[PDB]
Amino acid sequence: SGFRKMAFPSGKVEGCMVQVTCGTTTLNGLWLDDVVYCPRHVICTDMLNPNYEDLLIRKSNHNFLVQAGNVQLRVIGHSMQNCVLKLKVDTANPKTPKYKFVRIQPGQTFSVLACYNGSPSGVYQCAMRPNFTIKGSFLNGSCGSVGFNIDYDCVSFCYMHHMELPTGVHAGTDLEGNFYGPFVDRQTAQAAGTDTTITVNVLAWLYAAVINGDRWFLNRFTTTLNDFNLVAMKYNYEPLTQDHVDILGPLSAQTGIAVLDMCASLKELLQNGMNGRTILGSALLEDEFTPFDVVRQCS
Amino acid sequence: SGFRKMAFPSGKVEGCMVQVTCGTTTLNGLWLDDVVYCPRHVICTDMLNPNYEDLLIRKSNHNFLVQAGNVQLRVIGHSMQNCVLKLKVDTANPKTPKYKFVRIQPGQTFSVLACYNGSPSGVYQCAMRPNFTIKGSFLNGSCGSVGFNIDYDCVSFCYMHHMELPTGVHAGTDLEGNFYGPFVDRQTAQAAGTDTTITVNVLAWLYAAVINGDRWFLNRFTTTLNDFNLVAMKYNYEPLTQDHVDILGPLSAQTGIAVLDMCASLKELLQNGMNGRTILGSALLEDEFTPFDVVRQCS
Ligand SMILES: *[C@@](O)(C(=O)NCc1nccs1)[C@@H](Cc1ccccc1)NC(=O)c1ccccc1
Ligand SMILES: *[C@@](O)(C(=O)NCc1nccs1)[C@@H](Cc1ccccc1)NC(=O)c1ccccc1
């Protein structure tokens, strides 16, 4: 019993993290087979509007210093793909897990291994927000840290941390180097849009709470998809789709509570609040558990 | 920026987790040097009131099956220490980290690596509650999972999971096999006492929030230690000591807010609530960050 915000075991990623230095910029890199992936602004000193192409021109393989713990790696190639650099090294990482690079959708969750100078500091669970930011915990030197999911022995890398916005939220790329959302790797006038709540996730957490003993919010009412979406638009919740209803099926089946009945419970929680009660230890509705996360944790 | 509930990187522990089977009971074990540590109720089928001594009598080394991934380990010795078994195996774990066994105090936090059948499933941060339980997330088969802290390369094991109480909270031992609190490894009429809030931790989280931009709760008032403790007793918060004031010094120094001024802010939050605002993304006061956790994360 219990429901907690849980990350995947981080070991398979820890073995991949290295330190990359270029001139005087040190950040974190990700070493998989014979390539080290890092943010491209490792070649920068500038940040107002860098011509990354022209900055990479003054650089050769020997200008990139890659250190894996204490093992110094020999760089034999370098290229820019979008906003990442790929440093070919002469040795395969013996520690490379089975892995895939994946571009996730807003609403999906992942674990983050925060790193500084190539060394892991902590692990936590995050979500890609609807506005394509993540609410992380990152400090200077954290760029190059990565987000991932682990299915069986396979690591699905989905995020590389690049930057912190003036709002205190975080922006970054997939492992192909394309940013999530509209952000650019410059210090410019960029700011997060409207962050909306992830309705399908809230419902799944409501299901997690029933499985674990919290049921005061269960009402004697039901609703319709269109009726609920009117309420969600008012409260800046994302619209709920029949695809979302279908994904919640297994949770509906386990608990015997129909998705539309849970929607009417959420409806009442949105118009009435919690009246000083808590659900799974929180006085706010939680939207960073996917339906898959509830099933995995509760089974 | 950002403040999140963060666990230590779990890799050093993942390499220590094994599967222990005795008869038909399988649970998790912890393999360090040439000893595997597991809960002693691996030798049980009973649970009402087991005579553990007499159950261990019918067992020999070959009755304990230890599997580390797919490597089968050969047991050459066994003993009972308090509520754990120590299985001597013929090979040292090549993956053994530098480690220490530590009995932590209520109020202290640690990371938990939840395991099933010797395989890690997730990592999360927990605290030893004042009533010597932990509010974990554990399912059948999770016994033998461990809690730990990591300072530099040294793993400080502090918890082994044994049991879930009828209340849905969790109880377990240090790695010497002594339970935290009064619990016994039996299915009997045992229940958690009064859980109180960890005042020194709440204050440290209040400091974390100021560091990160949340300051609406900062008041134009101060208070005294005795005055505050009257308020804390009413709201079932632990008494605050001069030792606690001293531990918060570095956070006081960074932010320039005196501990007793923060106490007056907490005072007002306790008598008035949050009036529908949030602090660091929560509408409840958080007590599972130690002062050390705030500094480590915010630096
Ligand atoms: C990285 O870009 C980085 O850490 N990005 C993510 C952040 N999260 C919170 C704050 S920053 C590094 C690259 C770098 C630059 C210069 C020296 C060493 C590393 N950027 C910074 O660390 C940085 C951030 C803000 C102002 C100056 C420097
Ligand atoms: C462990 O004692 C165990 O998992 N303890 C911690 C728990 N947290 C939440 C639920 S239980 C195992 C040992 C065992 C016994 C029998 C077969 C395999 C393993 N106990 C249970 O898994 C168990 C719990 C509750 C009822 C029956 C069995």
Count of other CB atoms within 10 angstroms of residue B254: 15
Count of other CB atoms within 10 angstroms of residue A33: 12
List the structure tokens of B209: 């929030």
Q: How many residues does chain B have?
A: 299
Residues of chain B neighbouring A278 (CB-CB closer than 8 A): 284
Q: What share of chain B is helix, strand, coil (3-state, %, to 5)?
A: 25, 30, 45
CA-CA-CA-CA torsion for A109, B208, B105, A278, nearest 10 degrees?
-60
Distances (CA, A) of B70 to A152, A214, B61, B97, B118: 15, 40, 19, 20, 10
Query: Which residue, among B195, B257, B267, has the nearest Cα to B230 in the 3D structure?
Result: B267
Active site residue A78: no
**Among B16, B22, B115, B143, which one carries the catalytic annotation?**
B143
C-alpha span between B23 and A36 (Å, rounded):
47
Q: Do A170 and B2 touch (CB under 8 A)?
A: yes
**Among A16, A22, A41, A170, which one carries the catalytic annotation?**
A41
Q: How many residues does chain A have?
A: 299
C-alpha triplet A12, A18, A20: angle, nearest 5°:
155
Q: Which residue of A has its CA nearest to B149?
A: A122
Spatial CB neighbours of B244, under 8 Å, sequence gap ≥ 6: B199, B200, B203
B254: helix, coil or strand? helix
- Please compute, for residue B252, the number of CA atoms within 13 A of its CA located in the half-sphere on the CB side: 14
Query: What is the maximum alpha-carbon separation in chain A?
Result: 69
Determine how β-strand B98-101 pairs with β-strand B154-164.
parallel
C-alpha span between A245 and A160 (Å, rounded):
31
Backbone φ and ψ for B162, nearest 5 degrees, come out as -115, -50
Active site residue B41: yes
Residues of chain B neighbouring A281 (CB-CB closer than 8 A): 135, 284
C-alpha span between A172 and A164 (Å, rounded):
9
Interface check B139 vs A, CB under 8 A: yes
Q: Please report, in angstroms and rounded to a whole number, the separation of the first and last CA atoms in chain B.
A: 10
Q: Do B2 and A137 touch (CB under 8 A)?
A: yes
Interface check A48 vs B, CB under 8 A: no
Query: Which residue, among A189, A198, A194, A185, has the nearest Cα to A266 in the 3D structure?
Result: A198
Backbone φ and ψ for B76, nearest 5 degrees, come out as -115, 0
Experimental technique for the deposited model: X-ray
Q: Quote the minimal CA–CA distance from B62 to chain A in Å.
A: 31
**Among B41, B78, B161, B162, which one carries the catalytic annotation?**
B41
C-alpha span between A174 and A182 (Å, rounded):
13
C-alpha span between B75 and B66 (Å, rounded):
8
